Amino acid sequence: DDMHMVIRKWLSSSVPNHKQMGIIGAVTMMGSVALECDGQLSTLLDLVGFCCEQTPEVLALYYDELANLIEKQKGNLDLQLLDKFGKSLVEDFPNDFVVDLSPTVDGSFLFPVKSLYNLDEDETQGAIAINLLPLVSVSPICLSPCFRLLRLYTGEQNNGSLEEIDALLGCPLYLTDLEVEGKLDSLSKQEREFLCSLLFYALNWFREVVNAFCQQQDAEMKGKVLTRLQNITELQNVLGKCLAATPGYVPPPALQSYRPYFRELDLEVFSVLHLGPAELCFLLDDMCWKLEHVLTFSHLCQRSPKEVAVCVVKLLKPLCNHMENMHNYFQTVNIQEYQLMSSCYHQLLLAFRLLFAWSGFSQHENSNLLRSALQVLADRLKPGETEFLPLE
Prior knowledge:
The protein has helices spanning 2-11, 19-31, 37-52, 56-72, 79-86, 88-96, 132-136, 143-157, 162-165, 192-213, 221-244, 277-294, 305-314, 316-332, 335-356, 367-381, and strands spanning 98-99, 114-116, 129-130, 173-175. By secondary structure, the protein is an all-alpha fold.
């Protein structure tokens, strides 16, 4: 009763500071049923809805709270209890964001709506699309939290996430013509600020979907993932020239100045390396930025440094194959390609030093991990047959 009272008091508190802590405590309390349980939960969620039904940012934090809850203890979460609280999203999401994809879309938008980036579905589900342009003018901020929770719930209900949300991967996106990026001066700080926000939201949506679908491996899925990665790098290249003409801008809470505003990239994404130069440079930059902090940001901190180390060591073979390809190219050997390859090489070596300089290898418990990594490198040198050779 005391906990419920303090949670309700914080929910009704006028100062926004710590009001988010109310929803944090609410999801923490709901975690207690993660083995008449529904009554107190219903009262708490009624209070939360009353105190945040008109707050979009609070709704975003609420969805993120469920996402973190499912991610943390998704192994043995109760299916029926989770469904009884989360059944609303199945109707909430497509009714809000899943718009019709008819070609007769019209309105008072600043730029025309074009169905860019048609997926592998050649008109199979043309009536389904993500109408971001009418939505910006259900709020824009909450899209990727809601998609994250939908993905996690579908993974809970069904082992393969394809059976529920398979059509979402190849959907088009409502956007204007990229050629307008050349005529930036025509914007006059009226259209430029409008389209900057839209470009950020498009990048965040693409990051969310590639984060969702990359871990699951199926026939032809990986090609769609790689094409989406190409779409991300093309959009980022457009955004660079766009933001070059913006003296200042404040993006939503969610060219490395805009690093923290992007959606966090899951550590499973680097399983994709098992590709052009731009995508490889982008992924390696993300990996190096993570290892520069962990081994010397909310999602990867959930797991210990030992888990990060074993996950990184699992990927050592494709890195070696890439390095050998770089060596062959440079021996055999286009200013842009030369710069890209030099950056990739410098990103490959920095990752190597950050792995091997990990202080935790001083302790004796991690002898097997270091022996395995050195075994991989030695097997890369010779034909094989390490046979558990001596350390020297």
